[PDB]
Amino acid sequence: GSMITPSCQKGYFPCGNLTKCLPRAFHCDGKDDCGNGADEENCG
């Protein structure tokens, strides 16, 4: 049993597993926003 949850609010979202939070505009901007390989998703 493993039910992990995020640690961010509003349009912002947690950097996958990291403790970083990206803006809502991150949604398909043009390039990486996090740097770990998580925010890249949600854009193909």
Nearest approach, Cβ of 16 to Ca ion (angstroms)?
12
- CB nearer to Ca ion: give 7 or 42: 42
Size of the site for Ca ion (CB under 5 A): 3
Cα 18 → chain centroid: 9
Cα angle 7, 9, 11; round to 5: 130
How many angstroms separate the CA atoms of 37 and 15, rounded? 9
Please identify which residue in 33, 37, 38, 44 interacts with Ca ion, judged by CB under 5 A: 33
Return residues touching Ca ion (CB under 5 A): 33, 39-40
